[PDB]
């Protein structure tokens, strides 16, 4: 079959078409980062307005890309939450009404389940069970995954998510919002070990995270040192190394707790070069396996929604005629499949 997936949860409009035989047939994306940069954060009303401008044109482009017509589509999946209510509503209203007009099922998709299943789009996808580390702008969670919709929350950040931590320190370094990826580029030129950040919540037991204290440590380090490019790169590297070391320690403890041999990483921060290398190295030493999405499917995109939509449709999940969005929607509450 073929599913059209629609993602409008925050500031990316992503549309994709996934065929369960031939794989991904189309993938279209518009990122609004330039629209929000001048404000230092996503402005919900501007985000909502721009999804209206992009959603239909990118669906039209997706069909053209794939060389498909309306009749080739078997279901429409759309992100229903979590996310920004105004942004979710655009993709969800377009999606549900399109499905009605095409007389195909409409599949409401959980945004984080989309992230979690993104590594399934690659060759050699993970088998159950696995530990999943979801690390994005607003989420940082460890999950025990024993099957589709069988997600047990093991731990989560009690403050800043890893992604927002990257963005806040990047802002302190004078980078444009969201500066996470650019901080990582700076870090690549940094001298290992010149500064040393703490690894919060690693001295105590448990699987929860905290990153807010790293913004403070960064701020104080920045103001107490010189402003030359090398020093700034050294600060970026010490920050990145501390976040990565913290995530690795927590992943290790999750693998210990569950007994699992597979670790899946997803969400925007899973695009991080240092994190990908360090978790791969860890899994090699454990004689286990790591799994991640291609870098462009780590951050928000439509491909993961088309895929998760296909999985959910096959599990019997469809929408009635109501358009329901859920801006806060815990992953652990999804029905098993």
């Amino acid at each position: 079959m073929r599913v059209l997936g629609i993602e409008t949860s925050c500031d990316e409009t992503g549309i994709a078409i996934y065929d369960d035989k031939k794989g991904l047939l189309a993938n279209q994306l518009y990122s609004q980062v330039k629209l929000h940069a001048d404000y230092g954060g996503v402005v919900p009303e501007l985000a909502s307005r721009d999804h209206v401008r992009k959603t239909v044109p990118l669906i039209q482009a997706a069909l053209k890309e794939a060389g498909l017509t309306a009749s080739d589509i078997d279901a429409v999946a759309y992100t229903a939450g979590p996310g920004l209510v105004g942004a979710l509503l655009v993709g969800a209203t377009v999606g549900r009404s399109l499905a009605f007009a095409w007389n195909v099922p409409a599949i409401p998709v959980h945004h984080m389940e989309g992230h979690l299943l993104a590594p399934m789009l690659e060759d050699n996808p993970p088998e159950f069970p696995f530990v999943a580390l979801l690390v994005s702008g607003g989420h940082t969670q460890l999950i025990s995954v024993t099957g589709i919709g069988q997600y047990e929350l093991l731990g989560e950040s009690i403050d800043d998510a890893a992604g927002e931590a990257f963005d806040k320190t990047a802002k302190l370094l004078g980078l444009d919002y969201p500066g996470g990826p650019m901080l990582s580029k700076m870090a690549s030129q940094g001298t290992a070990g010149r500064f040393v950040f703490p690894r919060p919540m690693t001295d105590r037991p448990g699987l929860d995270f905290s990153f807010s204290g790293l913004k403070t440590f960064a701020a104080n380090t920045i103001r107490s040192n010189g402003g030359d490019e090398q020093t700034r790169a050294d600060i970026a590297r010490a920050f990145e190394d501390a976040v990565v070391d913290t995530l690795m320690i927590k992943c290790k403890r999750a693998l210990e707790s569950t007994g699992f041999k597979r670790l899946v990483m997803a969400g925007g921060v899973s695009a991080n070069r240092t994190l990908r290398a360090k978790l791969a190295e860890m899994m090699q030493k454990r004689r286990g396996e790591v799994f991640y999405a291609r870098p462009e499917f780590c951050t928000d995109n439509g491909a993961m929604i088309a895929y998760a939509g296909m999985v959910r449709f096959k599990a019997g999940v469809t929408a009635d005629l109501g358009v329901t969005v859920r801006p806060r929607w815990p992953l652990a509450e999804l029905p098993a499949a």
Binding site: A92, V94, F100, A101
Partner: protein, 230 residues
């Protein structure tokens, strides 16, 4: 000449269908429930008159102004339907729609339409029906402070009917204006009243492909200041 109209730009939710020489319509107050009601209502009105979406000649939608969220629900639903069935779309002003409603209910041919825009402002228009039933005055649509509306009214003459929640918010809007004001008996737009406007635009070739549909928000100021230096 089969036209389906939908609207969710205000606290109301409504759909209407002109098909086979009859008009069917449904209107209800749906505060906070638009997303749960709109597609069931579309399905219901279509099924009732035995019409398929792909047999529709044009899809009319409430383009705004109104609630930013509601305007977007309306255009989003309309876009999905129009994309799905390859329908041309006709955007209809919520302000003109209420003018048409005042005419239907009271015979009013000159209408001062005001919508409570929040933030101490109103969406405003001055609409006047010509001999052919076309509402002139679209160029007057604006978001305005009540004081500015009051100044504007002193430049108008004669008898007008008032419609919209802007008058609910500011019933003293026209104090000392010198106009003769009648109640237009319309607080919210109804899809039924979009139909004659849509039929005029259809005949004039003033429809658009789904990718060209645009909301009319009127208020376009961001409500957040840019960072220092931008």
């Amino acid at each position: 000449m089969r036209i389906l109209a939908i609207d969710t730009a205000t606290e109301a939710c409504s759909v209407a269908l002109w098909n086979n020489g009859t008009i069917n319509a449904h209107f209800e107050l749906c505060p906070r429930e638009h997303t749960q009601r709109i597609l069931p209502m579309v399905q219901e009105i279509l099924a009732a008159s035995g019409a398929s979406l792909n047999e529709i000649d044009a899809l009319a939608f409430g383009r705004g102004p109104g609630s930013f969220t509601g305007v977007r629900i309306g255009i989003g639903i309309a876009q999905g339907l129009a994309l799905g069935a390859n329908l041309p779309m006709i955007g209809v002003s919520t302000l003109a729609t209420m003018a048409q409603g005042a005419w239907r209910k009271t015979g009013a041919t000159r209408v001062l339409a005001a919508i409570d825009a929040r933030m101490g402002e109103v969406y405003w228009a001055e609409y006047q029906r010509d001999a052919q039933g076309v509402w002139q005055g679209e160029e007057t649509e604006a978001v305005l402070k009540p004081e500015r509306v009051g100044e504007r009214l002193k430049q108008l003459s004669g008898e007008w009917a008032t419609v919209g929640t802007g008058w609910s918010a500011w019933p003293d809007l026209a104090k000392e204006c010198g106009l003769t004001l009648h109640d237009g008996e319309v607080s919210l737009p109804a899809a039924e009243d979009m139909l004659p406007i849509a039929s005029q635009k259809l005949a004039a070739g003033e429809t658009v492909a789904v990718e060209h549909a645009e909301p009319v928000y009127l208020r376009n100021e961001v409500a957040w200041k840019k960072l220092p230096g931008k």
